[PDB]
Design an enzyme around this catalytic site. Structure first.
Site, PDB file in Angstrom:
ATOM      1  N   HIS A  68       0.820  -1.210   0.000  1.00 39.47           N
ATOM      2  CA  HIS A  68       0.000   0.000   0.000  1.00 39.47           C
ATOM      3  C   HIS A  68       0.858   1.266   0.000  1.00 39.47           C
ATOM      4  CE1 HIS A  68       0.348  -0.778   4.432  1.00 39.47           C
ATOM      5  NE2 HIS A  68       0.567   0.524   4.444  1.00 39.47           N
ATOM      6  N   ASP A  98       0.201  -8.103   1.402  1.00 38.40           N
ATOM      7  CA  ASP A  98       0.466  -6.675   1.413  1.00 38.40           C
ATOM      8  C   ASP A  98       1.968  -6.388   1.502  1.00 38.40           C
ATOM      9  OD1 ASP A  98      -0.052  -3.998   1.311  1.00 38.40           O
ATOM     10  OD2 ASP A  98      -0.716  -3.820   3.396  1.00 38.40           O
ATOM     11  N   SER A 173       4.503   1.613   8.416  1.00 38.67           N
ATOM     12  CA  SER A 173       4.205   0.435   7.590  1.00 38.67           C
ATOM     13  C   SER A 173       5.398   0.060   6.740  1.00 38.67           C
ATOM     14  CB  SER A 173       3.044   0.712   6.621  1.00 38.67           C
ATOM     15  OG  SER A 173       1.796   0.824   7.283  1.00 38.67           O
TER      16      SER A 173
END
Lengths: 228, 215, 220
Positions: A68, A98, A173
């Site tokens: 992402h 992801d 992240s």
């Protein structure tokens, strides 16, 4: 030259309790990742669209980050803690985990994350999250492993997440979760910002376990995609 | 007290440092004196001068300091400095006040365990635990050139001017602000800043001698 | 360096000792459309205090339940009966009837929490499943008037969320120090507090439980 060694001198003070050993071992291999997008609705100049972190996994320059973070990037920039900055190529990504893999091309040796393939994470293990929350610069936060997976169906929708209370924020992240030895335990995921009920969660964050992360990385490097 | 030392604990740091951290109240006239804001302060050395943040005591009609032993004193302003956001107070108590441990030889390292000590939401003195998360930070505001320690020891309104200490109880920093800038509604978690003790002591000494920082 | 022979810092010993006795508590509401499924009215945790199946939780967790469900970490799920509750202390006692032995929480009646002691909170935040968070004891009661309105709360910065109430706060030895209750979630100034949670001391909780078991209520 005198053949005898001189005494080594050391601190005369007590040692403070500290996880600096893990920081020294792991933090140099955790990078700041920037997704820059051409601003089409202005003069086509690049601007930070989103940001996160990444982990240098081997000396060749392969880096794991979160998909992402790098989705729809026109330019991916990777910044190291020693001040080096590189443009990265996207090697591949996997929506099921992801995860994404980047490659940088560097002249000088790259720091790599410590990995102990024989280490089993346990609930209660102290962990440090390393990433770039709010683009303040690399930040280390401390917590424990809160859970190592789930048997039943649950709100994460997944069964193999590490859960931790090391503070995670926008910008973390793709960064590293490591234990007190500096060994990689997982790759931190997107932050958990709001509950279904509308409460503000505190100390609830998730990471992809390192064993899965390395398996996915190897597949993306070899094939450019995950074939199952 | 026959303290039980068995469980894993930072009580050693607490017993050494917490008595020297005070609750600071900024009171202003209404009809009468109401609390405009509050924070904490640190009794720094045997001289008995207290360090706090300037923003805690600014525009105060009366400054009150409450010690953890139950005594309550009015505090008088020795001096302040806007650039570093520091202020020094003096209370009219007899000497012998508890003081914070300070080790001028100590260099804070990223990863060191720290305790924040202050008075969040006027709950009473509260100890929270974290680590030093970063050093040399400009802080919440992107523009400044000040240097801060960053920590994930939880701090809240009422912690400003309080102590950040290591497992020895040595003062690492003066807690000053919490990062609260949201991208899209989320709440930042575990990002707080403290003025390094070395700077705090240098500024205190200047304020005690000169009443202001001469630059 | 080579860290293969090094040992990671861990509180897993405390987790293994205490976590099996900390249960997920569900306050079920049937309404009109959930007669044949589990619609959760309120979520919490509880602590199995003895082999007979007596469990401590908070009264607010089980208030207005059409049915109370208790789930253990070993996968067993039981209907629980309300033995009694105490409004003053916001404590409640449940009873489960199990064929197989039950895990119980470690209790050291001589141990007292000290400020700065490392603690683990164990509960079911957001129905994620049993979750361990770590902090310290921030305060052990308050002598004078204060914003909680109470004098005997343990305060801790171990992260507590909706779903944790009724669960265990334990020290590094896995010994029960208190029963977690509601945390400070919104200040009057509209700020979001961080790291401010409260627990009922275990000595107080055990006294209340004993009374509720004996009488079904606290007799004055």
């Amino acid at each position: 030259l005198n053949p005898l060694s001189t005494p080594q001198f050391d601190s005369t003070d007590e040692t403070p309790a500290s996880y600096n050993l893990a920081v020294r071992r792991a933090a140099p291999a955790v990078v700041n990742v920037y997704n820059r997008g051409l601003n089409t609705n202005s003069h086509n100049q690049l601007e930070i669209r989103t940001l996160g972190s990444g982990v240098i996994m081997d000396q060749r320059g392969y880096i794991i980050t979160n998909k992402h973070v790098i989705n729809d990037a026109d330019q991916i920039i990777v910044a190291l803690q020693d001040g080096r900055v590189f443009e990265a190529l996207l090697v591949g990504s996997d929506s099921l985990t992801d995860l994404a893999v980047l490659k940088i091309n560097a002249t000088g040796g790259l720091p790599t994350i410590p990995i102990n393939a024989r280490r089993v994470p346990h609930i209660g293990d102290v962990v440090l999250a390393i990433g770039n929350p709010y683009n303040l610069g690399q930040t280390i936060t401390q917590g424990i492993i809160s859970a190592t997976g789930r048997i039943g169906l649950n709100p994460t929708g997944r069964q193999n997440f590490l859960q931790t209370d090391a503070s995670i924020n926008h910008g973390n992240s793709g960064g590293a979760l490591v234990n007190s030895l500096g060994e990689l335990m997982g790759i931190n995921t997107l932050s958990f910002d709001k509950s279904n009920d509308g409460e503000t969660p505190e100390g609830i964050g998730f990471a992809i376990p390192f064993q899965l992360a390395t398996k996915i990385m190897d597949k993306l490097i070899r094939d450019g995609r995950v074939i199952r």
